[PDB]
């Protein structure tokens, strides 16, 4: 079973500042044949369902703004929020769908500096 | 955009009793070519990440017990928990990955009768 480890676990940044969320897989999820990364990022706001943000490690879902950027490969990946807005406060999860079971990280809680 | 509507929104059953969770799509997610349903069910326990339970509408993920049963097709689907355990208390989400954006339901909160 591939293990998804995110860092940091939580983070507090000022409005309009940049946030960086790491995620490492215990095994490569880059597929040799198609050379595609089976890696997704989801956003979950409080009392709400998850929302798909990024897949194949770097593709934005429809309706997802450009301030959200997915990067990296194989075992190492990063979500960058370039200019943090208040509506971006939430829990962000990485997710691999390379093999079963398809596991998630424990989440990174991103909050506004008080 | 396909809309995923779950019912009931919440539900309280006694231990060892059966729970049934519906989910309707505003559009068919059965794929004509392969005749496969692009429908998933996730379980989210409190303060924890989501966990994939069922995909292609009726396949259990590895490590998922048989008391969890996915059924239905096209626009109409059901998760049945046959004999409710305390560790099954949580929020259950349906999810379509037929087209982008890949949307979720608002969740069904399942709790033990007090």
The rounded distance, in Å, linking the Cα atoms of A45 and A90 is 4
Q: Do the Cβ atoms of B61 and A101 come within 8 Å?
A: yes
**B73 phi and psi angles, rounded to 5 deg:** -165, 165
Structure tokens at B58: 């009726």
Distances (CA, A) of A64 to A58, A70, B23, B72, B76: 12, 11, 25, 31, 28
Q: What distance in Å separates residue A23's CA from the closest CA in chain B?
A: 14
DSSP single-letter state for residue B68: E
Q: Which residues of B touch A (CB under 8 A)?
A: 42, 48-52, 61-63, 93, 100-102, 104-107
Q: Do the Cβ atoms of A101 and B50 come within 8 Å?
A: no
List of E strands, chain B: 4-7, 10-13, 19-25, 30-31, 36-37, 39-44, 50-55, 59-60, 68-73, 76-81, 90-96, 108-112
Question: What secondary structure does DSSP assign to A42-111, as a single string?
Answer: EEE-TTS-EEEEEETTTEEPTT--TTEEEEEETTEEEEEESS--GGG-EEEEEEE-SSSS--B---EEEE
Instruction: Give the resolution value in Å.
Output: 2.2
The rounded distance, in Å, linking the Cα atoms of A103 and A87 is 26
The rounded distance, in Å, linking the Cα atoms of A79 and A72 is 9
Q: What is the CA radius of gyration of chain A?
A: 14
Distances (CA, A) of B53 to A100, B16, B69, B95: 11, 19, 9, 11
CB-CB contact of B69 with B79 (8 Å): yes
Tell me which residue of A94, A61, A98 sits closest to A78, measured CA to CA. A94
Mutating which of A49, A60, A103 best tests the B interface, going by the most B Cβ atoms within 10 A? Answer: A49
Domain boundaries, chain B: 4-112
CATH architecture of B4-112: Sandwich (2.60)
Structure determination method: X-ray
The dihedral over CA atoms of A103, B37, B60, A44, expressed in degrees to the nearest 10, equals 40
């Amino acid at each position: 079973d591939i293990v998804m480890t995110q860092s940091p676990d939580s983070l507090a940044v000022s409005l309009g500042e940049r946030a960086t969320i790491n995620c490492k897989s215990s095994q490569s999820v880059l597929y040799s044949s198609n050379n595609r990364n089976y890696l997704a990022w989801y956003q979950q706001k409080l009392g709400q369902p998850p929302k798909l943000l990024i897949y194949w490690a770097s593709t934005r879902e429809s309706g997802v703004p450009d301030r959200f950027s997915g990067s990296g490969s194989g075992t190492d990946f990063t979500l960058t929020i370039s200019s943090l807005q208040a509506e971006d406060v939430a829990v962000y999860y990485c997710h691999q769908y390379y093999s079963h079971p398809q596991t998630f990280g424990q989440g990174t809680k991103l909050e506004l500096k008080r």
